[PDB]
Write a protein that binds this DNA or RNA. Structure first.
Ligand SMILES: [Zn+2]
Ligand SMILES: [Zn+2]
Ligand SMILES: [Zn+2]
Ligand SMILES: [Zn+2]
Length: 111
DNA sequence: TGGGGAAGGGGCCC
DNA sequence: GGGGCCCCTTCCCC
């Protein structure tokens, strides 16, 4: 547990404090060597490296389809069985993604 | 109404 | 012991 001096906000993880402080500044030190695109976080750069490399480490356990990104894999999982897994309690409406539920819970104003 | 992309925080392990 | 590498979330916009 560490507290950010700039924002007085608790951040979990001893080594994660430099990452949060970088979010206040807008610096993007990590730069891809191929497309010369800068990213704020290293793990974001590695995902961009997957796009350049074309590797798909996420393989479906039901049909064997290979996808490059985790959310792409989860989208394929919803095609198999998980289509529309979110519901609105107030109005009884189904949704595909969790952000759409947040959009509905704010824009629709059922409550 | 749906999806791609990006921006953040957290857990595990070294 | 700062950090890679994975996970998760909501937001912006077409
Ligand atoms: Zn801060
Ligand atoms: Zn690149
Ligand atoms: Zn599949
Ligand atoms: Zn509703």
């Amino acid at each position: 547990f560490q507290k950010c001096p700039i924002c007085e906000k608790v951040i979990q993880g001893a080594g994660k404090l430099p990452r949060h402080i970088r979010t206040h500044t807008g610096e993007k030190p990590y730069e891809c060597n191929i497309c010369k695109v800068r990213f704020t976080r290293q793990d974001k750069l590695k995902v961009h490296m997957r796009k350049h490399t074309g590797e798909k480490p996420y393989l479906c356990q039901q049909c064997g389809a290979a996808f490059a990104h985790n959310y792409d894999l989860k989208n394929h999982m919803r095609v198999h069985t998980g289509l529309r897994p979110y519901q609105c309690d107030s109005c009884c409406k189904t949704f595909v993604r969790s952000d759409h539920l947040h959009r509905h819970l704010k824009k629709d104003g059922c409550n």
